[PDB]
Amino acid sequence: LQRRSDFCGQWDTATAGDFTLYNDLWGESAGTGSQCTGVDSYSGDTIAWHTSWSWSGGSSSVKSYVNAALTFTPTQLNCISSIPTTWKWSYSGSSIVADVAYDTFLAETASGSSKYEIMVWLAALGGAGPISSTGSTIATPTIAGVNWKLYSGPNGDTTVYSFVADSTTESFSGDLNDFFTYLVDNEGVSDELYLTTLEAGTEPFTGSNAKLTVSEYSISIE
Ligand SMILES: OC[C@H]1O[C@@H](O[C@H]2[C@H](O)[C@@H](O)[C@H](O[C@H]3[C@H](O)[C@@H](O)[C@H](O[C@H]4[C@H](O)[C@@H](O)[C@H](O)O[C@@H]4CO)O[C@@H]3CO[C@H]3OC[C@@H](O)[C@H](O)[C@H]3O)O[C@@H]2CO[C@H]2OC[C@@H](O)[C@H](O)[C@H]2O)[C@H](O)[C@@H](O)[C@@H]1O
Numbered sequence: 001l002q003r004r005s006d007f008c009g010q011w012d013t014a015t016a017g018d019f020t021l022y023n024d025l026w027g028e029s030a031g032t033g034s035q036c037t038g039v040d041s042y043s044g045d046t047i048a049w050h051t052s053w054s055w056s057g058g059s060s061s062v063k064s065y066v067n068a069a070l071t072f073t074p075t076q077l078n079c080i081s082s083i084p085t086t087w088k089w090s091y092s093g094s095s096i097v098a099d100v101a102y103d104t105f106l107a108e109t110a111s112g113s114s115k116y117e118i119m120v121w122l123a124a125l126g127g128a129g130p131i132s133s134t135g136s137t138i139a140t141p142t143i144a145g146v147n148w149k150l151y152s153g154p155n156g157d158t159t160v161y162s163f164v165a166d167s168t169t170e171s172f173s174g175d176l177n178d179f180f181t182y183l184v185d186n187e188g189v190s191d192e193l194y195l196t197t198l199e200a201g202t203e204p205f206t207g208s209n210a211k212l213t214v215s216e217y218s219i220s221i222e
Contacts, residue, residue: 006036006052017042019068021049024201026065030058031206037066045070046218052211055204065103066212067201070219074110077184078191083176085219087122087200090170093210097126099203100212101162102176106193114196116189117155119162120148120179122169128205130162131155143182144174152187161187176219195221 007014010025016039023037035053042048051066089100102120107113121130129135132151139150141163148163163179176198183189198219202212 006038008034008036014039016047018045018071019047020071021068022066024065024067027061027063030061031063032056035064035066045220046216048215050211050213053204054208054210055206059206062203062205065201065203067103067199068217070198072221074194074196075221076192076194077180080177080221082222083219085176086173086216088171088216089212089214091212094208095126096207096210097128097205098207099124099128101203103199104195105197107196108193110194110196114158117158117160118179118183121162121164122172124164130164131160141182143178
């Protein structure tokens, strides 16, 4: 028999080389729809995958964060020399309100609660916007070959910094650690914090008959 192979459950996952591919439909209760995900290929620190979705309702509420998460031991920033990454992706769908973003977390201890979250958005689609206490940038730095718009704002007892590419970026390669150095140098983030999480995926708000194709994604820590 041939069956649907994509996984669709709220907390379903797949293991793929150095990655976990999470469905992470954490916000599904905020609306109506569904989301199914699958691995296409993998080899060590590289993965190709896709996700398709339709979400309605809860227009300002994220429904999910399907993502490829690197398996690694939490490491203090001052022990990291570079985090090379490459990401090639494309989106299809209608009325897509979503981002394509890295999601990363810093904590005082390896097993402890997060203190900072750092997102790096390669795309803001359909008017999607980052968490921001003002609605405006705090800085507009050039990092890893891209001109970014940096925002900040709270999420519970954490501060979220979001670097948003000036233009939609379907193909990206550079050193993700440059974003952590930037915040250590410019925003008072301690270089003694542990990087606990390195994820790359998409946050949908609303849209229909959407599909993200990640043709290539790689990341490592040196
Ligand atoms: O009992 C059911 C199963 O629970 C699983 O645990 C889940 C928790 O119940 C969820 O609370 C948790 O949701 C978080 C999710 O993993 C993150 O991806 C998401 O990150 C947000 C971030 O908060 C936001 O600041 C940033 O802008 O955007 C990212 C991406 O969307 O955050 C979720 C929680 O925060 C939101 O909800 C609470 C609000 O107060 C807050 O404002 C919201 O933002 O997810 C876990 C599962 O997470 C794990 O798997 C998915 C991975 O992607 C993730 O990294 C892993 O930690 C249990 O694990 C299961 O065993 C249970 O069956």
